[PDB]
C-alpha cells in the first residue's frame, strides 16, 4: 500500500467507522460514500486539480461542487458533480473527489477530504 501512517487515528476511523459495516469492494465503496455524504457540507467551491497528460500533470480548474455523484457512480470511485466557474457557470460535469481540493469548507468537510487523500495515496482497498 503506502507507509503514509501519519498517526493511527485515521486507520482506526477507517476500520471502525468508515468501512466497519463493509465486507467486499462494493460495500467498502458504499461505506466511504455514506460517510462522505453524511460529512461533506456540499455545495461548496473547490479546485478540480485534474490529473492529466499521463505524467501526473495538474490541469487545475476552478469549480463549484453541487454534491456527491449518485450511489451508482459511488460504487466505482468517490465522485462529485461540479460546475466549471471558469468555463460554463451554467452546466455541470462530474469529477473524482480524488482530483478535488475543497475551498473555504468546514473542518469536518476538509477532514473527510484529507482522510480520502490518505486512502488515495495508499492505492485503495476497494
The answer to whether 79 and 95 are in contact (CB under 8 A) is: yes
Instruction: Indicate if 99 and 120 belong to the same structural domain.
Output: no
Look at the chain and report how many structural domains it folds into: 2
* C-alpha cell, 120: 488515495
User: CA triplet 79, 83, 89: central angle to 5 degrees?
Assistant: 175
Cα–Cα distance for residue pair 34/50, rounded to 1 Å: 24
Residues 6 or more apart in contact with residue 32 via CB below 8 angstroms: 18, 19, 74, 78, 116, 119, 126
User: CA triplet 96, 99, 103: central angle to 5 degrees?
Assistant: 110
Helix (H, G, I), strand (E, B), or coil: what is residue 7? Answer: coil
Cα–Cα distance for residue pair 42/64, rounded to 1 Å: 9
Instruction: Indicate if 69 and 102 belong to the same structural domain.
Output: yes
Q: Domain of 118?
A: 1-40+107-126
Query: Can you list the alpha helix ranges (DSSP code H) found in 5-89?
Result: 8-13, 25-39
Q: For residue 51, say if its preceding peptide bond is cis, omega within 30 degrees of 0.
A: no
Instruction: Indicate if 46 and 102 belong to the same structural domain.
Output: yes
Torsion of CA 63, 42, 120, 60, to 10 degrees: 10
Neighbours of 77 (CB within 10 A): 16
Q: Which residues pair with 13 in a beta bridge?
A: none
Instruction: Indicate if 57 and 101 belong to the same structural domain.
Output: yes
Cα–Cα distance for residue pair 125/108, rounded to 1 Å: 23
Q: Which residues pair with 79 in a beta bridge?
A: 96
The structure was resolved experimentally with NMR
Instruction: Indicate if 28 and 53 belong to the same structural domain.
Output: no
End-to-end CA distance of the chain: give it in Å, rounded: 12
Amino acid at each position: 500500500m503506502a507507509s503514509v501512517e501519519r498517526d493511527e487515528t485515521r486507520e482506526h476511523r477507517i476500520e471502525t467507522e468508515i468501512i466497519v459495516d463493509a465486507e467486499d469492494k462494493e460495500e467498502r465503496a458504499m461505506g466511504w460514500y455514506y460517510y462522505l455524504d453524511d460529512t461533506l457540507e456540499f455545495p461548496f467551491m473547490g479546485k478540480w486539480k485534474k490529473k492529466s497528460r499521463k505524467t501526473s500533470t495538474i490541469e487545475e480548474k476552478t469549480v463549484e461542487v453541487l454534491g456527491m455523484a449518485p450511489d451508482d457512480e459511488c460504487l466505482k470511485d468517490m465522485y462529485v458533480e461540479v460546475a466549471d466557474i471558469g468555463g460554463k457557470d451554467d452546466d455541470v460535469y462530474t469529477a473524482k473527489l480524488s482530483d478535488i481540493e475543497a475551498i473555504d469548507v468546514d473542518d469536518d468537510t476538509q477532514e473527510a477530504i484529507a482522510d480520502w487523500l490518505y486512502w488515495l495515496a495508499r492505492g485503495y482497498k476497494f
